[PDB]
Amino acid sequence: AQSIDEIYKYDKKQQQEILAAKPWTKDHHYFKYCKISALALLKMVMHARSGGNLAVMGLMLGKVDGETMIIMDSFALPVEGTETRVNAQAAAYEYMAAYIENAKQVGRLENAIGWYHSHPGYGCWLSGINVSTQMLNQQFQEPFVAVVIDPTRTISAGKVNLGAFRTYPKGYKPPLNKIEDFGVHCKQYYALEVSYFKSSLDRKLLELLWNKYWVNTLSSSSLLTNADYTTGQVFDLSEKLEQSEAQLGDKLAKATRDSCKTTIEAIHGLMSQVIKDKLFNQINI
């Protein structure tokens, strides 16, 4: 409690200070982290799946802290988009103008922070028109982020498949694996590292409603399902360490953090294995 109760406490003094300082005007590579709430993630997924193979989109509410964009809520714009293109001609704008006021009435103090949009079957990336719209929104509403969610890929793969991106300003002059995953404008935007967070009461009711999948965890047995992922993390971490030592002549801190995360997940798997062995193999001789 208390410390984990943070991020939901919204203050206006800090928001005004960071919005008046405008530190992103100097450093274009400012925002690197996107902290999305569980409610926003769930609403985004359900809205994206509701449109089927037609593209749907909406707004976001949230704030900025340092170099991180915090998403606390999601919208649902009344847009009737085609199977590959959403427009938001005239009803979406009035709807999002009215929804902010209606939320102000009930107590939602978060302002608009970006837009989320569905890519039904073509991954998560920013196309030419997505890049143009996001860069316009950044040029006139400086704190902004464009999130793209694939509903069909999420349902097929069984994992949440979405990304957060921010465009570079026009004129930003500064390999082959970034051309099929992204578009031809892949150098006009960058991907923020996306992390998800939940609250104390949300996790309380989630663990309370966790009563059918205990068998799944008692025999989950990682270090075999995530063996390929772990070795991928390791051989990326080796290159990160090489970059850090080249810098040595803070990248080293980030490499150490990644190594700690990978090692901690491995030891978590080993702890699960040890607990299972104690539970099932040390009984009846």
Binding site: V215, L218, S219, S221, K276, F280
Partner: peptide
């Protein structure tokens, strides 16, 4: 071995249920 252990643990839990 280990996948067999997983399967046997799952079967034990299913038997309990």
């Amino acid at each position: 071995a280990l996948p067999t252990w997983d399967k046997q643990i799952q079967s034990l839990c299913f038997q309990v249920n």
